[PDB]
Write a protein that binds this ligand. Structure first.
Ligand SMILES: Cc1cc2nc3c(=O)[nH]c(=O)nc-3n(C[C@H](O)[C@H](O)[C@H](O)COP(=O)(O)OP(=O)(O)OC[C@H]3O[C@@H](n4cnc5c(N)ncnc54)[C@H](O)[C@@H]3O)c2cc1C
Ligand SMILES: Cc1cc2nc3c(=O)[nH]c(=O)nc-3n(C[C@H](O)[C@H](O)[C@H](O)COP(=O)(O)OP(=O)(O)OC[C@H]3O[C@@H](n4cnc5c(N)ncnc54)[C@H](O)[C@@H]3O)c2cc1C
Ligand SMILES: NC(=O)C1=CN([C@@H]2O[C@H](COP(=O)(O)OP(=O)(O)OC[C@H]3O[C@@H](n4cnc5c(N)ncnc54)[C@H](OP(=O)(O)O)[C@@H]3O)[C@@H](O)[C@H]2O)C=CC1
Ligand SMILES: NC(=O)C1=CN([C@@H]2O[C@H](COP(=O)(O)OP(=O)(O)OC[C@H]3O[C@@H](n4cnc5c(N)ncnc54)[C@H](OP(=O)(O)O)[C@@H]3O)[C@@H](O)[C@H]2O)C=CC1
Lengths: 462, 462
């Protein structure tokens, strides 16, 4: 027996929920399949609990300035368990809201793990029951990548971001492996909260896919914050000891000889080396659904798979792994399918992003090097500044603000904006609207500044 | 004997310095006359020292959340003198930088008070020496308004924002009079830092020229922060007592009878009731230079006075009293005069502004009521939201975030943006660029969100 819907969504995370809710608004008879907790990575083990911990870190860092601002010092210890409990309660409140959003939209929730069947007409099975629809969205997300034991014996002794959100105490000594978003954000949080923290990176800098200015500056800010950045370093082996884990490292700096070092007494080894898509047990082969070598579902610009009536959005596709991207792609797809808007699709250019470092990073558009490759060196002009925000005019501790504008062609179209500094997390969104509209440098300089702010520096570059 | 220049600038504040520096870049032989401290109101008694005190307040308010975020409480007293000294040192550093900027630009500094002479060819006198130029800019700013003794006996016992920056101790008990920027900002700072603070306003709400949503919300946030808002209340008399000042108030709420109340034991009475232009001793009559009844210099859209070769910018003109406005008008004027750009002028529409309340306010463009008057009620559509930022998901203390988008005509051109909330001070600038470019609601909704932030709510209104 097979129940029919207009729309079946596999995965109740950001993308799947957003697409189902918009489809239902257009009248679709929809159901969402979820094997674990509604809200997916974002709510449970991602964006939201991360941000709570970032706010906790941020608070702690500012408090090192309390005496400089005229107050008696604040010298006691952080209590991880306090905030863990409150963070968990917030996640539970969101789980309840997301469930209610589906109920209010009359979207059926199917609890369990979906897999495709080999019915020529696309059908899924969940707990022995079959479901079909003319439109099936795969929105199953990803999971942390960990090294294989055959490569790094002992790797299973480390944790990932999933395990980070299960920690019940502050680790005394932390080693974070990797050089992208999670490594940067988690190292900064753990070090701000009092862990003796090292960040082990394969090259000389973090965030190497970002503009060079950001990669340089972020690495410097980590070091100045007390994170020990172990450059040109990789883990060879991990062993359990009486005193935590011992991490065997190889360091191979260009121009020097390679060197092996043991790092003893590690309480927390965190692998932050990318994500892999959650597709292994979907039975994609039963329908011939195309994947790459890593298991990502292949899609066109409209989120179609190679199989009619099957679509995919979000992290499972491997492109632009951000909550708002999953949401926007999922909504655009709902309008295409259920409002018949044949040209509705997400533009993957000019997507803004923030890294919750200390201070935070904002970027949208092309790096300077990407613009030079695209437009030619003679047709790219960059404008930049660096300054110490006036917040620190009265403090002994310092952070910098760096900003870069990348402009193309004679009209100086703004094709990239890159910044790190206090406030940059909230500053970027509006600049992203201007960039999406094709703003030129003249449009920025025609906008009157707001004083005194950091944001005004972006409209007064020369 | 009369020394000749291309450009004479009266006043070394925001507008005067900016215009002189841009003129010098274009080759002008320029001089700036300054009777007091370079940097004017902004550096000395305005923007900069205010912002240092705002940061001190902001810090204090966040620290009431320290135990909620997992730290042992921080229970000692603020020491005003600590921060006053550091604030004064920062002002001194800026005075030195501004002086050096003029030296580096080869702009002569004339120390003293300028007044016009009655030479038909426009000439000024400073300390008995005469100076002339074909172009003279009046950039003399304003000063705080205080009541006349004939209206409010004892008014001279109060201070203004100038005197606020001379305070050497935290006043125990503060009464702030007025209902605009300074009253809101100063009440919030004094109350956050521990003064028992009342705000005495003539009507029911503060910021009545702002969008109604902002006026309402700001008033509510002041009250929820512990500021006592004395509505429909005005000062009749002030007397010196053994215990501070006694303030005699009349309260006249619509629908009730008027009532007289004495407020005893006031340490600080602050008048925040507007500014008046600094023109009384300029000898404007010697050249027939036109003023209004309040003493503002009258100008056209190009900052011309009614007298050829004489111009005015900034607070002395009474329009859009903000540092960036003075600067932008002064730069545009320099390009008109010294680069011969006959159409160079400042557009006074779509100037953004922030009020440094708790939380801060940002606005650009038309209020909902202004848009209805301009476009017709049937041609205005507003979008709004209200939420509690996730910063407070773990705190007992709360603040709200409110946002309003005002759209006009079938294309839903964004003609106003109004917000109050954590981060709004740094969020506004980029949205102001989009508004200046004529963004529509579709341009906002075509921009992918940044998560988790408050700023994303402005691109996801429905
Ligand atoms: C630590 C961390 C921090 C991050 N911080 C941010 C941030 O600040 N901002 C940002 O924009 N992005 C951030 N991201 C990225 C963001 O969380 C992801 O891009 C987004 O969650 C992906 O959404 P999705 O819908 O593709 O997948 P997911 O939210 O991962 O949802 C997939 C859902 O499918 C379910 N599922 C899987 N297979 C099946 C099956 N066969 N049957 C039924 N259910 C199934 C899963 O249980 C899950 O709930 C962060 C990620 C991590 C890991
Ligand atoms: C408490 C307070 C807080 C503020 N906060 C902000 C804020 O956060 N953001 C913002 O954008 N705006 C703010 N403002 C407004 C801003 O400071 C003013 O808009 C700006 O300073 C005006 O610049 P100006 O060049 O017109 O005048 P001023 O900076 O006032 O400069 C005029 C100069 O002329 C000199 N002078 C006057 N007459 C003569 C004469 N005859 N001969 C020689 N010299 C003379 C004066 O000594 C002075 O230095 C604030 C103002 C106040 C009072
Ligand atoms: N604020 C936000 O928006 C957040 C978003 N996310 C999203 O989730 C994605 C996944 O995050 P994350 O796991 O950090 O992945 P990322 O891909 O961002 O970064 C991992 C980096 O680690 C390095 N690396 C890769 N393999 C290894 C290896 N075997 N050993 C050591 N280092 C290695 C690489 O940098 P190198 O080549 O320099 O060594 C690589 O770029 C992010 O890219 C982002 O899209 C995650 C967190 C926050
Ligand atoms: N963050 C920034 O950008 C800042 C900018 N500034 C600039 O400086 C200007 C001057 O600030 P401020 O002095 O606050 O002036 P404002 O004009 O902003 O506000 C004064 C308000 O006080 C009320 N008022 C006026 N006369 C009296 C009276 N006799 N008794 C009681 N209340 C009275 C009025 O409101 P009502 O009619 O409701 O009684 C009036 O609107 C600002 O307008 C702004 O342009 C100042 C500070 C910060």
């Amino acid at each position: 027996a097979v129940a029919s819907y207009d729309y079946l969504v596999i995965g109740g995370g950001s993308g799947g929920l957003a697409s189902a809710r918009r489809a239902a608004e257009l009248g679709a008879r929809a159901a969402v399949v979820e094997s674990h907790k509604l809200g997916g990575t974002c709510v449970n083990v991602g964006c939201v609990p991360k941000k709570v911990m970032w706010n906790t870190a941020v608070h702690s860092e500012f408090m090192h300035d309390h005496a400089d601002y005229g107050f008696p010092s604040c010298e006691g210890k952080f209590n991880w368990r306090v905030i863990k409990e409150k963070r968990d309660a917030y996640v539970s409140r969101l789980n309840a809201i997301y469930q209610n959003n589906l109920t209010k939209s009359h979207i059926e929730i199917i609890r369990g793990h979906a897999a495709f069947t080999s019915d020529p007409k696309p059908t899924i099975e969940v707990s022995g029951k079959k479901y079909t629809a003319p439109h099936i969205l795969i929105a199953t997300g990803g999971m942390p990548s960990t090294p294989h034991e055959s490569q790094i014996p002992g790797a299973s002794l480390g944790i990932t971001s999933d395990g980070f959100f299960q920690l019940e105490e502050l680790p005394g000594r932390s080693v974070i492996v990797g050089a992208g978003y999670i490594a940067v954000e988690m190292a900064g949080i753990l070090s701000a909260l009092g862990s003796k923290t090292s960040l082990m990176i394969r090259h000389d800098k973090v965030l190497r896919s970002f503009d060079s200015m950001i990669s340089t500056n972020c690495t410097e800010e980590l070091e100045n914050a007390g994170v020990e950045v172990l450059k040109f370093s990789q883990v060879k082996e991990v062993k359990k000891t009486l005193s935590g884990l011992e991490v065997s490292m190889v360091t191979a700096v260009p121009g020097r000889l390679p060197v092996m070092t043991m790092i003893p007494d590690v309480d927390c080894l965190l692998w932050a080396i990318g994500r892999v898509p959650n597709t292994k047990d979907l039975s994609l082969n039963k329908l011939g659904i195309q994947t790459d070598d890593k298991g990502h579902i292949i899609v066109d610009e409209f989120q179609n798979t190679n199989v009619k009536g099957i679509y995919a959005v979000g992290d499972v596709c491997g492109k632009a792994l951000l909550t708002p991207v999953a949401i926007a792609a999922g909504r655009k797809l709902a309008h295409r399918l259920f409002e018949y808007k044949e040209d509705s699709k997400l533009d993957y250019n000019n997507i803004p992003t923030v890294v919750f470092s200390h201070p935070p990073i904002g970027t949208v558009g092309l790096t300077e090097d990407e613009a030079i490759h695209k437009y030619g060196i003679e047709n790219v002009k960059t404008y930049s500044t660096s300054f110490t925000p006036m917040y620190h005019a009265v403090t002994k501790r310092k952070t910098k603000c760096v900003m870069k504008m990348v402009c193309a062609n004679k009209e100086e179209k703004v094709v990239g904006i890159h910044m790190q500094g206090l406030g940059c997390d909230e500053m970027l969104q509006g600049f992203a609207v201007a960039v999406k509209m094709g703003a030129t440098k003249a449009d920025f300089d025609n906008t009157v500044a707001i004083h005194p702010t950091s944001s005004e520096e972006l409209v007064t570059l020369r």
